[PDB]
Symmetry: C3
Subunit: 158 residues, 3 copies
């Protein structure tokens, strides 16, 4: 599907490149789409609400504060996302149950693994501006990620 390196060559300055802090935890090597942003901390309630919805062509970008203390995505949440056809997830924080994740048809990029699950309370905000890995992400931007890296573009690419 997507080659981030080839797309950097083609699009040059028209993309930003996230710092190399992520690893792929999902069964899908590359993914792309238009992004919905979320900002939260050690609480995934809001991603539950968002992952219920259809996600075909969308990528969920999550600012979790870079917490590696508690996990934002586990098997339950990722199955939801696969079943609603979400292209992929970018988690500035942690994931859980990694053996189940490497088996699901979704990209998942994250910082680390930790077995403790996040709170479920529903705290946080969506469609807001977030910043991590030296990149600010606006809901509506286009992201592309593979095992090489993650890039962000205002306008779609191809």
């Amino acid at each position: 599907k997507y080659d981030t390196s080839e797309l950097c060559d083609i699009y040059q300055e028209d993309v930003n490149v996230v710092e190399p802090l992520f690893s792929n935890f999902g069964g899908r090597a590359s993914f792309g789409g238009q992004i919905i942003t979320v900002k939260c901390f050690e609480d995934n309630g809001l991603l539950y609400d968002l992952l219920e919805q259809n996600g075909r062509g969308r990528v969920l970008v999550v600012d979790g504060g870079g917490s590696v203390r508690r996990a934002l995505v586990d098997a339950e949440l990722a199955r939801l996302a696969v079943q609603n056809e979400w292209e992929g997830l970018v988690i500035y924080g942690a994931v859980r149950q990694v053996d189940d994740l490497e088996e699901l048809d979704i990209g998942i990029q994250a910082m680390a693994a930790i077995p403790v699950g996040a709170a479920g309370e529903g705290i946080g905000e969506s469609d807001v501006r977030v910043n991590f890995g030296g990149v600010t992400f606006f809901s509506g931007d286009h992201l592309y990620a593979d095992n090489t890296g993650i890039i962000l573009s205002e306008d779609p690419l191809d």
Copy 2:
């Protein structure tokens, strides 16, 4: 054989969690058991003594000081430990011959790999109070490890 995240979800607070500093190098993705502790540094003497003994039902939890300059476990020592029925090893230190270690039916968690072997002089204690990764380990505690993380408790679980 173990899903550390499920475990965190049932036991809640009754479980302690190790900082995400370790990776799996053994052929067993997940293992658990009652722990015997060792404290040593860039010497694997004691370990030979322990792993010569039958380890069925036990996990060797080794505070090697976090050294990544010398490897405490290689193929030979790991094979010994397989043959002696040891469930798994956890090294706050380094291993060696990782290609060989992947093929061996024992759990192995370490911080890093390094081709230089530990000395064999014998120095170190065992059954002593050790601490690393944000966790205190006591001989007779129970540990549970998968590709997601490492948990430790006083009583057995499940």
Copy 3:
């Protein structure tokens, strides 16, 4: 083809050990040969000159200044390296297109992956004393590498 642990046991002090800074990106788990050093920075033009020449029995040792912002080697450059029989590349810097790199019959050790390509200007020097990861490299020196680590020696180790 090579076991670095083993060679440290046989040769001890006659070998220098590189710090655990690198990962494997190539199809070969292990490799070795006589090194030709390069010193450059976010530019890979010289790498193209060098890898056009026959590399059987040889390892390109690249001091790219540890930059993880620009990738010195990509699929295209590594395929040229395979075509001219090079044993391996050790990059003190980044690589690109990691999925393609895993399938090419050559050894590649590097620090990280970044999607952005290096400049092709050609700046840099060849066959010069370079230092990184606690080791100094001279053309003529011999390198042996695997998933456990990387070592350097003055004379061949067969």
